[PDB]
Write a protein that binds this ligand. Structure first.
Ligand SMILES: COc1ccc(CNC(=O)c2cc3c(cc2CN(C)Cc2cccc(OC)c2C(=O)O)OCO3)cc1
Ligand SMILES: COc1ccc(CNC(=O)c2cc3c(cc2CN(C)Cc2cccc(OC)c2C(=O)O)OCO3)cc1
Ligand SMILES: [Cl-]
Lengths: 148, 148
């Protein structure tokens, strides 16, 4: 559970926002890309796994699950690549609610920057700091408890 | 001390590698950019502070220290922007040694990818996982101890 992440892809302004959620904490990382490709997803996962101890990734769709480039990145980074089938039906709603929240925050800051990527990183910051513990606090505590 | 980071700028293949080091752990984040500008540095710090609890940043040079865009990003993200004067003379050597190590790793993986940015993220991964604890383990433990 400390090492479990979920990929999520949402759309805004004709661009793609790729999100990784640490399932146990709600902590996120995100990036803007022109379109979701295997190569972009693979690079995103490489970045993620260099920064946090990623054991398992539930992929966001079948194309990324199938992608040999994504499989290669997961091999390289020591990640178990899994499907994202919501065996628990509450998973759909949770991700739906997160995308809605994220877009709301992006709207609240969108005029503080020209580029969507800047607004998305502001939204990541606000989400991860929001308190009673924050997602940023929870992920660190969860992983530290695991290490020891 | 848990919140203290240092910026570092190094060059390879006619490009710039921008690095943030968590001083107490040696944990790093890095990105490739075509050139170091205030805007690029500001965006990099915004990303960093959304991901880790950044209290203080020692800037890498006077241009980034002076930059109103960098100052604005630090204001936005709640970061105390400081100079990077090595009051401790061992700081020069430590960063020098880190850039050398990073470039060595980049060389060891450079043929596993076309794009320099990919090789740099592989290097970040290897650095942060290298064991006796790893830098990734140390940063989580340091911050978790602080939170509690
Ligand atoms: C992250 O450091 C920051 C520092 C200050 C601010 C304060 N905001 C502004 O000054 C502003 C507001 C706007 C605008 C254009 C700007 C100025 N830019 C240069 C900010 C910026 C800076 C760096 C990278 C960026 O993107 C890679 C962008 C970006 O614009 O996205 O157009 C509509 O409202 C926002 C971000
Ligand atoms: C983390 O995802 C990875 C998965 C597998 C691999 C294995 N390596 C290769 O297959 C390879 C080796 C090469 C090469 C070109 C490639 C193929 N590319 C598409 C890899 C790649 C993928 C994604 C984004 C990328 O860059 C944004 C790049 C990139 O090339 O930088 O040219 C010289 O040696 C490397 C990375
Ligand atoms: Cl790690």
């Amino acid at each position: 559970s400390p090492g479990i992440w979920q990929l999520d892809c949402t759309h805004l302004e004709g661009k793609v926002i790729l999100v990784a959620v640490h399932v146990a904490s709600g902590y996120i990382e995100a990036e803007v890309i022109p379109a979701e490709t295997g190569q972009e997803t693979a690079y995103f996962l490489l970045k993620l796994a260099g920064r946090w101890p990623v054991k398992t990734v539930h992929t966001d769709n079948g194309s990324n699950f199938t992608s040999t480039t994504v499989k290669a990145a997961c091999w390289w980074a020591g990640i178990k690549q899994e499907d994202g089938i919501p065996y628990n039906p509450q998973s759909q709603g949770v991700i739906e609610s997160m995308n809605k929240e994220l877009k709301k925050i992006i709207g609240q800051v969108r005029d503080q920057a020209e580029h969507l990527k800047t607004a998305v990183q502001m939204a990541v910051f606000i989400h991860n700091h929001k308190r009673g513990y924050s997602a940023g606090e929870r992920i660190v505590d969860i992983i530290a408890t695991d290490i020891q």
